[PDB]
Structures are given as C-alpha cells and as structure tokens.
C-alpha cells in the first residue's frame, strides 16, 4: 500500500465519497506514520458531508422561507470555491505528498469549521430569526472569521431589507410565510 494510493483516496474523502471508508473516517497493512495523518486529513470530509447535507435537506422543503433559503444559497458560493481548489490539486496527483497536502489544506480546514458550525447554531430558525442568529457570530474578533460571516450576513439580510423597503415606502407587506416582524390581521 504505497503513499500514492492514499493520496488517490484522500482526494475523494474530501467530498464524502470513500481504503478510507466511513463518525470518523476509519482507515483500514500500512505504517502508523501514515494512518495518523490520513485520519487527520480526512477530518475535512466529515466537515464537508455535514454542510452539504444541511443545504440539501433544506433545499427540498419550501417551509424554510425567503430569509432561510438566501442563507442556504450563500452556502453554495462558499462551496464552488471548495470545488475549484480540488481541481487544481487533482491535476498534480499525476508531485504532492501528505506533508505537502497539510500546507495546502490548512486554511480550508477553518472555513470548513466555521460553516460546519454555523449551520448547527441556526437549525430551527425560519425567517428573520435566522438573520439574527448568523449575526451572533460576528462578535468574535478573529479577523479571518469576522470577515467571512460578515459577508454571509450581507446576503442573508438582503431579503429582510427587501420587506422593510417595501413596508416603509409602499405599505404593502406580502409574505405567505411569516417572516417579517409586522404581522397583519385579516
């Protein structure tokens, strides 16, 4: 079991597709100095399968609402980026090793650690209450996270500021799902 085979499978565990199988990705021989780094590197997939499933499960029912969907949609432009980096890495496997991969995927282990922990803090939040629970992640100070979440807020809070600029200049609120904080009585 060479080192080139593990790099062949790891580039697929980064997506969810499983030597390395499926909560840790227990690998099943080879030397101990290899299994440990594989277990560590594969931790990026378990952060990727969870975020993709959340966006998918919610992209099925229309019960989430306009604010929720916007946040869910914002989780795809931050996944195309993760789907591009893999393509450049994939073209070099034809040289890179596990040590080289660590200096490559050290940053996207953080973005895939805020997003994979931003979709759990706001689970049942439907409507503006979601745009208020992705704003409670800006009080963090970390200049790398406070400048990422403060961008998803700029997309999630666009539908909210769409009702507001409607319910102020025209006074015609319209939301079949109850999101706006102004509730009308028939």
Partner 1 sequence: SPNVLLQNLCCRILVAQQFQYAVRVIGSDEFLVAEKIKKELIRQRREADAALFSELHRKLHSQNKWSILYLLLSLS
Partner 2 sequence: MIHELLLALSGYPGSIFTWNKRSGLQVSQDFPFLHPSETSVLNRLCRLGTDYIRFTEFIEQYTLHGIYLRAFCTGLDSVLQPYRQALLDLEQEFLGDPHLSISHVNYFLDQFQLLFPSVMVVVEQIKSQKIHGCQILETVYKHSCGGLPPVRSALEKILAVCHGVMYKQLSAWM
Partner 3 sequence: LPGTLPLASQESAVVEDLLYVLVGVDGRYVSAQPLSRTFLVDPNLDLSIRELVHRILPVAASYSAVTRFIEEKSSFEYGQVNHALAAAMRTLVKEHLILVSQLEQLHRQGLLSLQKLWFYIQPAMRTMDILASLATSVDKGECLGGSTLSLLHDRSFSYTGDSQAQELCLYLTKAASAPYFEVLEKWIYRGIIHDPYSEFMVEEHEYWDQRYTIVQQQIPSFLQKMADKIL
Site residues, partner 1 (CB under 8 A): 81, 84-85, 87-89, 91-92, 94-95, 100, 103-104, 107
36 touches, from partner 3, partner 2, partner 1, none (C-beta below 5 to 8 Å by class): partner 3
Q: Is 103 in the site for partner 3 (CB under 8 A)?
A: yes
What is the nearest approach in angstroms of partner 3 to the Cβ of residue 146?
A: 10
Residue 140 touching partner 2 (CB under 8 A): no
CB atoms within 10 A of CB 83: 11
Q: Which of 59, 86, 85, 62 is nearest to 74 (CA)?
A: 59
Q: Are the beta carbons of 115 and 78 closer than 8 angstroms?
A: yes
**Sign of dihedral through CA atoms 159, 124, 149, 38?**
negative
Residue 23 as a binder of partner 2 (CB under 8 A): the answer is no
d(CA 78, CA 152): 9
Number of H helices, E strands in the chain: 7, 0
Out of 5, 22, 57, 83, name the contact with partner 2 by CB under 8 A: 83
77 or 92: CB nearest partner 3: 92
Contact track, partner 2, 42-71, x by CB under 8 A: -----------------x----xxxxxxx-
């Amino acid at each position: 079991i060479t080192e080139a085979a593990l790099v062949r499978d790891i580039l697929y565990v980064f997506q969810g597709i499983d030597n390395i199988k499926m909560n840790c990705y227990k690998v099943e021989n080879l030397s101990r100095s290899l299994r440990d780094t594989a277990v560590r590197l594969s931790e990026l997939g378990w952060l990727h399968n969870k975020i993709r499933r959340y966006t998918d499960q919610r992209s099925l029912d229309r019960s989430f609402g306009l604010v929720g969907q916007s946040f869910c949609a914002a989780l795809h432009q931050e996944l195309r980026e993760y789907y591009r980096l893999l393509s450049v890495l994939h073209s070099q496997l034809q040289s890179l090793t596990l040590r080289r991969l660590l200096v490559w995927t050290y940053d996207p282990k953080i973005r895939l650690k805020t997003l994979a922990a931003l979709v759990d803090h706001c689970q049942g939040r439907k409507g503006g209450e979601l745009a208020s629970a992705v704003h409670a992640y800006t009080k963090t100070g970390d200049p790398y996270m406070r400048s990422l979440v403060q961008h998803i807020l700029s997309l999630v809070s666009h539908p909210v500021l769409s009702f507001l600029y409607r319910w102020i200049y025209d006074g015609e609120l319209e939301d079949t799902y109850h999101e706006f904080f102004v509730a009308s009585d028939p």
